[PDB]
Amino acid sequence: LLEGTMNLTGETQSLVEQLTMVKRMQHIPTPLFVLEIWKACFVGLIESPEGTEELKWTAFTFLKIPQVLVKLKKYSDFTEDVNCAFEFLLKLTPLLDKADQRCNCDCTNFLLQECGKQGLLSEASVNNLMAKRKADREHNIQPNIQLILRAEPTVTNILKTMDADHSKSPEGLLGVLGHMLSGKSLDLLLAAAAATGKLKSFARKFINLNEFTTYGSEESTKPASVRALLFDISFLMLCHVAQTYGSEVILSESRTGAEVPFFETWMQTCMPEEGKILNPDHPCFRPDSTKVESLVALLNNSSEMKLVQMKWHEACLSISAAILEILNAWENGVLAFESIQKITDNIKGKVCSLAVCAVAWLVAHVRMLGLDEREKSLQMIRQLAGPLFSENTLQFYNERVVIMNSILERMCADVLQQTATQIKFPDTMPYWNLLPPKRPIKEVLTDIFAKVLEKGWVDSRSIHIFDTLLHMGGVYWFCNNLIKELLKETRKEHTLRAVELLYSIFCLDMQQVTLVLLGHILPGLLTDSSKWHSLMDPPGTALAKLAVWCALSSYSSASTRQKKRHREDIEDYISLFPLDVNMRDPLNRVLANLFLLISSILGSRTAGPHTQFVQWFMEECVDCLEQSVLQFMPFTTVSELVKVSKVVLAITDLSLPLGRQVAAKAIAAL
Amino acid sequence: MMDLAYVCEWEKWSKSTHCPSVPLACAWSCRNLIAFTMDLRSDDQDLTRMIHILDTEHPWDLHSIPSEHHEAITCLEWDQSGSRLLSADADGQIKCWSMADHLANSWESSVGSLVEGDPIVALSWLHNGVKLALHVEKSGASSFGEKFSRVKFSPSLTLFGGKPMEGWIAVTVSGLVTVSLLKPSGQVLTSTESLCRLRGRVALADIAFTGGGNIVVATADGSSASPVQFYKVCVSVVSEKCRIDTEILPSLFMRCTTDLNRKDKFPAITHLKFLARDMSEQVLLCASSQTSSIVECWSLRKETILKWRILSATNDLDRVSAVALPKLPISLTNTDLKVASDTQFYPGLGLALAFHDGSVHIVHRLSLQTMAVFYSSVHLKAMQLSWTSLALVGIDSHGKLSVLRLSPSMGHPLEVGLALRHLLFLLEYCMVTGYDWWDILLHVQPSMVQSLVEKLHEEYTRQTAALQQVLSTRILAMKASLCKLSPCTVTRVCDYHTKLFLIAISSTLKSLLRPHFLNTPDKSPGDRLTEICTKITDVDIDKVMINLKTEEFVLDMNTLQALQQLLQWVGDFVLYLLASLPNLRPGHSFLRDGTSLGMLRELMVVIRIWGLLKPSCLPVYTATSDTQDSMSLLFRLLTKLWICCRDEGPASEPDEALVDECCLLPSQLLIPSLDWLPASDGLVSRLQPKQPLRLQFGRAPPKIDHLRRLHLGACPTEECKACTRCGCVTMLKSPNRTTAVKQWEQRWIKNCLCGGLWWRVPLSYP
Amino acid sequence: VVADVVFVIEGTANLGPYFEGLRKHYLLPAIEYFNGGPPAETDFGGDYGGTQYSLVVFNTVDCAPESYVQCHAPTSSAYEFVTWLDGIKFMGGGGESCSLIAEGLSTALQLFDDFKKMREQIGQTHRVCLLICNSPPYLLPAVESTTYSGCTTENLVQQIGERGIHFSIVSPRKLPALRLLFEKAAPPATDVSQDPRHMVLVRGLVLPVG
Amino acid sequence: PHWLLGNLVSDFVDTFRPTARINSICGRCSLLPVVNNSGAICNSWKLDPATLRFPLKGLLPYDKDLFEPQTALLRYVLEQPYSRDMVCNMLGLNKQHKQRCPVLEDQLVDLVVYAMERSETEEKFDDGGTSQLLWQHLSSQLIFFVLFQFASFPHMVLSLHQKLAGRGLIKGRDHLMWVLLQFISGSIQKNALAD
Ligand SMILES: [Zn+2]
DSSP states (O other), rough: OOHHOOOOSSSSHHHHHHHHHHHHTTTTOOOHHHHHHHHHHHHHHHOTTTTTTHHHHHIIIIIIIHHHHHHHHHOOHHHHHHHHHHHHTTTHHHHHHHHHHHHHHOOOHHHHHHHHHHTTTHHHHHHHHHHHHHHHHTTTOOOHHHHHHHHHHHHHHHHHHHHTTTHOHHHHHHHHHHHHTTTTTTHHHHHHHHHHOHHHHHHHHHHHHHHHHHHHOSOOOOHHHHHHHHHHHHHHHHEEEEEEEHHHHHHOOOSSSOOOOOOHHHHHHHHOOOOOOOOOOOOGGOOOHHHHHHHHHHTTTTOOOOOTSSSHHHHHHHHHHHHHHHHHHHHHHHHHHHHHHHHHHHHHHOHHHHHHHHHHHHHHHHHSSSSTHHHHHHHHHHHHHOOOOSSSSOOSSSHHHHHHHHHHHHHEEEEHHHOOOOOOOOOOOSSSSSSOSSSSSHHHHHHHHEEEHHHSSHHHHHHHHHHHHHHHHHHHHHHHHHHHHHTTOHHHHHHHHHHHHHHHHHHSSHHHHHIIIIIIHHHHHHHOTGGGGOOOOOHHHHHHHHHHHHHHHHOOOOOOHHHHHHHHHHOOOOHHHOOOHHHHHHHHHHHHHHHHHHHHHHHHHHOHHHHHHHHHHHHHHHHHHHOOOGGGGGHHHHHHHHHOOOOHHHHTOOOOHHHHHHHHHHHHHH | OOEEEEEEOOOOOOOOOOOOOOOOOOOEOOSSEEEEOOOOOOSSSSGSSEEEETTTTTTTTEEEEOOOOOSSSEEEOOOOSSOOOOOEESOOEEEEOOOEEEEEEEEEEEEOOOTTTTTTEEEEEESOOOEEEEEEGTTTSSSSSHEEEHHHHSSSSSSSOOBBOEEEEEESSSSEEEEEEOOOOOEEEEEEESSSSSOOOOOOEEEOOOTTTTEEEEEEOSSSOOEEEEEEEEEEETTTTEEEEEOOOOOOOOOSSSOOSOOOSOEHHHHHEEEEEEEEEEEEEEEEEESOOEEEEEEBBBBOOOOOEEEEEEOSSSSSEEEEEOOOOOOOEEEHHHHHHTTTTOOSSSSEEESSSSSSEEESSSSSSSEEOOOOOOOOOEOOOOOOOOEEEEEEESSOOOEEOTTTTOOOOOHHHHHHHHHHHHHHHHSSSOOOHHHHHHHGGGHHHHHHHHHHHHHHHOOOHHHHHTTTHHHHHHHHHHHHHHHTTTTSSHHHHHHHHHHHHHHHHHHHHSSSSSSSSSOOOHHHHHHHHOOOOOOOOHHHEEEEESSSOOOOOOOHHTTTTHHHHHHHHHHHHHTTTTTOOOOTTSSSSHHHHHHHHHHHHHHHHHHHGGGGGGGOOOOOSSOHHHHHHHHHHHHHHHHHSSSSSSSOOOHHHHHHHHSSHHHHBBOOOHHHOOOOOHHHHHOOOBBBBEEETTOOOOOSSSOOOOOOOSSSSOOEESSSSSSOOOOOOOOSSSSOHHHGGGSSSSSSSSSOOOEEEEEOOO | OOOEEEEEEEEESSTTTTTTHHHHIIIIIHHHHHSOOOOOOOOOOOSSSOOOEEEEEETTTSSSSSSSSSEEEOOHHHHHHHHHHHHHHOOOOSSOSOOOOOOOOHHHHHHHHHHHHHOOOSOOOOEEEEEEEOOOBOOOOEEEEEEEOOOOOHHHHHHHHHHEEEEEEEEOOOOOHHHHHHHHHHOOOOOOOOSOEEEEESSSSOOOOO | OOOTHHHHHHHHHOOOEEEEEHOOOOGGGGGGOOOOTOOOOTTTTTOTTTTTTOOOOSSOOOOOOOSSSHHHHHHHHHTTOOOOOHHHHHHHOOOSSSSOOOOHHHHHHHHHHHHHHHHHHOSSSSSSSTTTHHHHHHHHHHHHHHTTTTSHHHHHHHHHHHHHHTTTTOOOHHHHHHHHHHHHHHHTTTTTTTT
């Protein structure tokens, strides 16, 4: 459910590696494992909000999850186990009926035919399962699943046909692209391409189309008025991709030569994202003084009448300075409001991407301003993002208006949250502004963790609030408060469930959470003499399990906020852990320090609950391992652990030639 | 320049193992008390939750408040006075520690706020509207109104009068801000409110105040490519409750992100600091990579009307580990910059920047060019300049706590008159305020001491006759503490302290006599007594006592009996002085001071009257004869000494008749012994330039109560307070709560007479 | 009747031992006269019409970085005022005889200005100021006050005496300067002292004759 | 458990989870009666007067909600008209003996602050709008429960003061004052004024 909610566009190999990890940590039978995959997928589909998220969830269950199962089959008698899991699932009639009411069709039929196509299931199994499902079921628009399952081959074939610009026929390109701009067709193609790993090539194709249509050639009005529309369609769909599926699918990741495209630089330096706030007087927003006067004269001329040669990248880069001079003119008073209306109509009318570039600079500039100084510039957005200017539209105007209104919603939302301002473009932002306005943020955390424990699984909305709290209060505060809420449980059942949930919650940034957990929380609980009454057997065994699962999963080795924040972070782990493979990698340093602490606790006097804790930690280090986290164990632990009470030697030693000597010493002298 | 005054280390309690370090707090008060936390980490984590109070003159004695802070202490903050300490940790919980029984060794918090779960990231007391500016170009101007002048600042939240409320404002790691207002009663009002509607991370924050009673709070989320946002907060009280009104101000981005050559380095803003609280228009930022850093200064200045423009920035540094901003409120304008560059006055123009190597840079405020460099020969994890900014304290990446002295001209050699004028200017600033002057005595060389004392007396004169009233005991304390510092002048300090004690007795005895009826009105009976004792120069005590309306000098014969020990000190000091006359000793100054001998005469006369009312109040003298009137004998010799000095323009050397009569005094009476107050354990006399003292904490490299003159035993059973400056000892609780002269005991509840604080001394148990 | 009562007390070591006696003999009866019958726990604050009490406590210059005056907000409860009078701790003092009467009187003036902006339902009321002091004034002009800075005690007590504020002095030790200040605060156009030593001159208010 | 026993006892009690799972009416927290004034109370709805918990047979490990105070049931019954005898049969009140039952008192206070909240929502769109009906029923119910000292007046008033302190609930304070006037006007002569 986490991989469905946060990164649909992630590669399947990382997910297969993580799932095989989880299957090896807690020893999970294969039918129950695949059953939990299908149950999670269907529950997340039912709980999805209506709109793009529902399309994305249908793609994840229908396309990505069947591919993941195929990779598991190669890595691992899988057909018998997946057939068993399908019978396990087909007992759950209320889940499947809720799903069928949301799917508007029987979605289990499409699942069984899809798993038949991938080869997870034999055909006789498929047919008797569909017979059972029809018997249990007995008691004009195509649904989204058929659209997606047929739209993935259109993704491949649209790649292969628009490699060549429809044999350089821009009228054909425009018609097919307008059909894509029609309702929901773009979203269907993007959801299929995201779930099937082909969003990068799709973005490369539209970016290359954009580079081709940037300059243009000697042309009369009719050919150019097609070329500017191609620029608009490619630009608006690229902005919609970058706002929905993240910006890192737009990046080229290696550009040999300086010829980075226009849209990549514009998105890099000029488009607001979630964690990106922009400098309005960055040198990117001040290209020249020469072209910008030509452009303000161009906007004050009339209907451009000169779209026959515009070099649209230069125009779009220059609009920021242009509206800056317009704003200074209006702040002095030398321009009337009625001429402002004329300039905004000349911007937003013929080409809609100009409005997006202007609104991006306006959002940066309004974010920098004070409270009382804002009032004029917001009116500019009200005219740039207003309803349609009419009677000179090129073609496909209403659909570009719809996509543009979505992009401007997601650009302006933060600034229009700072001051209570309604622009009212007409849900498209279903998980946005989730925290209560005044409540301290630990109450939010404890309430959501209480509800996740009492349900037994993590919702999608709960995943989004947990992400915002991890970004807001930081890793240490987050991990410490969740572990406190663990340690005040008193039942065996609730402690084991809380740990099995907290591992997945910590999979937001597993690596940093393990550094905080094994470096700050656990040494503070083991070293403080007042604290270790909290380390009693009910919560203590569960906590030791969570620490060893975190250590193993971090050793063997994910969201965009977490990528940005770890790139922000500066710390000296050599100075933090002085320590009396690389050993400049911080996780090796934390593990070496923790095992020194464990040996020191086992060797000392005053046995208490903390000694029981380090016993349990070493025992699940032994049991959870296949064979290595225990490569960092000091060899004195081999002697001491059976002083404090076989296999806990023979696994922990890692079997070097000197390691046999310590092994044979301990095992013979038990 | 920089000299390490001392390095105080823990003994064997270092080597924190297996648990990583934490950031430290440090706070230097107006009185010289350092409050700081350290990472001790031995057998408990509460050893990282203890707040150490270190009086800067006796560092070995470190008090350790066991704060009940469940997470790590983020911020420490002294009052505008020095009397309370705010401490806030992660997960809310601001506690307000106050002194217990006015001891600087016992702290206890009754008042606090709590925003649970949210880590406090900035904390400040509210501003009480007092702000003064120092005009260095008027250093010779011979009036304290010209040198230091109040600058018309308004306090946030005035309540029904001119009186500001006291309270704090804290900023959490979420968007939340909270204000707590302490009533004059024990009540406390809290209110929390988000800073802006877009709730977001506040990883660094800072608080300044403005004229107009507006708080200005700056927030950053550490990313260094995101804006440093600014909010104006206005506090109000609506009819029962606090009310917070916030408003966005112009944010700023940061240079080195628009550098465009290599902009990706320095990705973390690590310190955000206004240049001083109440200086809300300038902001110091410090971007840092793993190895290098940049500090920058910005200013709000208007032309978009208000707009943050950069002032200056350093080139490239090491990674800045700590930052200390000055506290001396210089006047900062262009003429004062000129005269402080000409006459090399540099105390208020420095910031200190520690680095991740050993070095420390004292750098200019306005254009951040390095003024001095001190190489440690391990890094400073917390620094704090002093209130006169002559010394900076600093806690290292070990247990070590060091105090460095910064010279006022930053190592450039000055002629002696300029150094005299600088240190005299600072001592006058500490005299007008009540701040402590210990850091100044770090910089006073012995060879200048006497000249400096002369200048103080000349500046004690030529003020406007009410300043001379209010600066009396402050200048006696400063004179004594200066004269401690030189071997030529070390003999006089005892005199100064007895002078304080004499005045402290004299007025109080003249305070006790309530005239039962007003005869010869418009003169209080202190003045009638002084007039009568100065016009009647009769050598007999009876002839003076006759003419003094002795039905007026009446007490209730209970307090009159309880005054016995103070009257005993008066008689014994008179006898010691007169026997000391034939001989540099503890009494040498008093033999030629006509005024003090007049005071001793007046006390002997009122002692005679009170002895006739009740004979048990009198001092006792072991007389080597039984037909003797010892009081009349000492009064005869005192009048004959005092008529020497009560002449106009006299300096009469004492004649031989007095010399032989005072040679006969050990024959007639037994001269007892006396305790002299400054039992000197201060470091400033012990220190030398170019040699740092290396101390251990708690190692510390005929017992009387000096204020109520009670003899404790050999090893005293009742516990005691010691003054931190002079060193006088008093027992902690009064011996007889029924018979206690509260007019005398209640003077020294909060301080000593010299001015320093009390500090509880531990019992021996031999 | 409606009264704006302001007490100005010297919180120093002198007035330390004598305060308890003064309260029983003079201060407590004076509060009762304004509030008929002694107060006990039923009196509620917040009636902006009615009698409103206030404290101003001042100090000498030995509380060197601390503030000089501690003022309390107005209360309509006589009982809260009694608890405030218990809550004073007399800890100050040192080697001096004088105190900062100018500061206490200037903040009393600011109290009476804020009272005058408060009560507009009545134009003028019984505006009573008491000074419970044991010490002659300093020669400092007032420093820690706005709108009454740079004023000596004589100028401030002239401004108290004009505009119709009834100024009273209760002192446990008979003094010349206090008598001169009382004579100066004469409103425009009886032995109340129970103990002979006490000097009590009350321009306004009725106290049982002793 | 003690740190020496530990798992040995805890896991043991966990194996008695299915037996407790057999002996639990599922959804018992969300089942509500229809309040009839007839008497002859079914003993399913009886609560514990000390702690508002359901009385449970045995010492088994029951489900975590059955150890919580059932305030939802008691608030639903107190909001109904003519639920006077049913609340006494629930909390075991007897009316021959006066007791000052505390959890009843806290539930009545929370009912008052809920009525104050729902009055402060609008109360002006619909004139009846269930608000003034709720305040009338609150008058009658609270008169009975404070009059026989099953709850007490001044603890109720000062706890009510602590709930309304700082919450800023002012639109229907006249109704709350009216209800308090019913108590005072009912029983001023019986008690001292310090109450
Ligand atoms: Zn002293």
